[PDB]
Symmetry: none
Subunit: 80 residues, 2 copies
Amino acid sequence: MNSLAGIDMGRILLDLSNEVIKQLDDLEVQRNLPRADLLREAVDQYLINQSQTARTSVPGIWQGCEEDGVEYQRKLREEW
Amino acid sequence: MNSLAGIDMGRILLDLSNEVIKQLDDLEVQRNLPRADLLREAVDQYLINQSQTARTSVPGIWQGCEEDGVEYQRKLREEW
């Protein structure tokens, strides 16, 4: 008998310590809203912060290193 | 701490929007780490940001307005 209040909306389980529940409760009291509502906003906010700009950041380290060559020297290679 | 790494974390259900599960996947995959870790930091990060009122609060009652704090243990039974 799953009426599903939300359409096309999934659900996930969250594991948090009891001490955390107390923290959320305090936030819920002041906001007078359910945790689920707070959690949803937390994620949405997280994604927004994660994805917003990329100009500030710069490409990692990439060059391949170890390049090939003629490999024909020796002789007086040293001290030269 | 008397004990840690124990199992007794409260379970909480989070409702998202399908397409959200995918968004998280990209972050979880790209970063190559457990989602639970991503969520944990998500909430914690939210709590930290929503903690600008930290004016050194410390009620004498130590929070007692909600839940008197009672549980049946001591004796009881939990297999042995």
